[PDB]
A paper describes a structure:
DGC domains containing the signature GGDEF motif synthesise c-di-GMP from two GTP molecules while EAL1516 and HD-GYP171819 domain-containing PDEs are responsible for the hydrolysis of c-di-GMP to 5′-phosphoguanylyl-(3′-5′)-guanosine (pGpG). Hydrolysis of c-di-GMP by [name] domains has been shown to require the presence of divalent ions, either Mg2+ or Mn2+, with the most efficient reactions occurring at alkaline pH2933. Here we report as yet structurally uncharacterised [name] domains from the core genome of [name], PA1727 (MucR) and [name].
Ca2+ is a well known inhibitor of [name]-PDE activity. To better understand the reasons for the inhibitory role of Ca2+, we determined PA3825EAL structures in the presence of Mg2+ or Ca2+ ions with bound c-di-GMP. The Mg2+ and Ca2+ complexes show metals in the catalytic centre, annotated as M1 and M2, coordinating the phosphate group of the scissile phosphodiester in c-di-GMP. The Mg2+ and Ca2+ metals in the M1 site superimpose well between the two complexes. In both cases, the metal is coordinated in an octahedral geometry by Glu39, Asn98, Asp130, Asp160, a non-bridging oxygen from the scissile phosphate (P1) of c-di-GMP and a putative in-line attacking water molecule. Significant differences are seen in the positioning of the Asp160 side chain between metal bound complexes, with the second oxygen of Asp160 contacting a peptide nitrogen atom with Mg2+ bound; while the Ca2+ bound complex shows Asp160 bridging between the M1 and M2 metals. The M2 metal shows octahedral coordination for Mg2+ but trigonal bipyramidal coordination geometry for Ca2+. Mg2+ is coordinated by Asp161, Asp183, a non-bridging phosphate (P1) oxygen and two waters. This contrasts with the calcium complex, where Asp183 is not involved in coordination but instead Asp160 and Glu217 make contact to the Ca2+ in the M2 position. The different positioning of Asp160 and different coordination geometry of Ca2+, together with physicochemical properties, thus contribute to the inhibitory effect by calcium.
Author numbering: 5 to 164, 173 to 260
The structure:
């Protein structure tokens, strides 16, 4: 058995599926978007998490097609059900540093946007800070062109350089320590105040407890994500939950 053959095969056999984690407003309410998380439906080994296969997809370069396959799948999955989505519904995708080279990404974004009514969803791309240090100001007509389509850019796992981004996502590690560490609390308050100075939206990730939600809401964190709001879930659970939310 070989890792490369297995992934390359799995992509052709459509074994990489989207799971969807909902985002909620900081002050609560209906779901305003989802983060798309990759899952490997392995026929032998079961449902396999990203951390056991994304690193090799990045080294081998195969994540770029995998992400394209995933974006296409999301358009199939949700393009027909646009009526169930609140206006400006956020759909986020995790993107690599290898994606940031050159211009294909723009085609894929235009393709996804074309599956929905114009302006009805907001497409978001999440990059970590560490993934931006490969080229920091060069072939970045890409970000200009992506923004011209109304695509937004989010810094993933923030807190764990000079752009050109619309949103910060507070890493789980900060949210985990809310209420039991004044230092981390002050640093988290700094990140939140920075986002407001720079006019960037902010999402908190890993919101598990009501203590955490209230703390973040009291400081105007725009959006929440985590097990409190809902775990990553298959297409069907999402459509079922969104159907309920159309009622009242
Ligand atoms: N403890 C805790 N964990 C929570 C909570 N809410 C969500 N999570 C987990 O946090 C991860 C999402 O954060 P991430 O920074 O994108 O971290 C992601 C992301 O870096 C990467 N990844 C996932 N899908 C993709 C993809 O399509 N492309 C790329 N390049 N990377 C991906 O794999 C990482 C792990 O993904 P998952 O295993 O799905 O792990 C998910 C999810 O299961 C919570 O309340 N508590
Ligand atoms: Ca993410
Ligand atoms: Ca990533
Ligand atoms: Ca994170």
């Amino acid at each position: 058995a070989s890792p490369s053959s297995e992934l390359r095969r799995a992509l052709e056999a459509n074994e990489f599926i989207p799971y969807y984690q909902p985002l909620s407003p900081g002050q609560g309410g209906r779901w305003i978007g989802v983060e798309v998380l990759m899952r490997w439906r392995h026929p032998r080994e079961g449902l396999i998490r990203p951390d056991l296969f994304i690193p090799f997809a990045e080294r081998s370069g195969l994540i770029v097609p995998m992400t394209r396959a995933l974006m296409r799948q999301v358009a199939e999955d949700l393009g027909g059900h646009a009526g169930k989505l609140e206006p400006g519904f956020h759909i986020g995708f995790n993107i690599s540093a290898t994606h940031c080279h050159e211009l294909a990404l723009v085609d894929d974004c235009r393709e996804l946007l074309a599956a929905f009514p114009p302006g009805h969803i907001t497409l978001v791309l999440e990059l970590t800070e560490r993934e931006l240090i490969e080229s920091s100001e060069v072939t970045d007509r890409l970000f200009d062109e992506l923004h011209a389509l109304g695509v937004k850019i989010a810094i993933d796992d923030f807190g764990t350089r000079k752009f050109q981004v619309d949103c910060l996502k507070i890493d789980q590690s900060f949210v985990a320590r809310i209420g039991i560490d004044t230092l981390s609390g002050h640093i988290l308050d700094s990140i939140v105040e920075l986002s407001a100075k720079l006019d960037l939206d902010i999402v908190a990730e890993g919101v598990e407890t009501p203590e955490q939600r209230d703390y973040l809401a009291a400081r105007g964190v725009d959006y929440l994500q985590g097990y409190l709001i809902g775990r990553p879930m298959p297409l069907e659970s999402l459509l079922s939950s969104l159907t309920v939310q159309e009622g009242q």
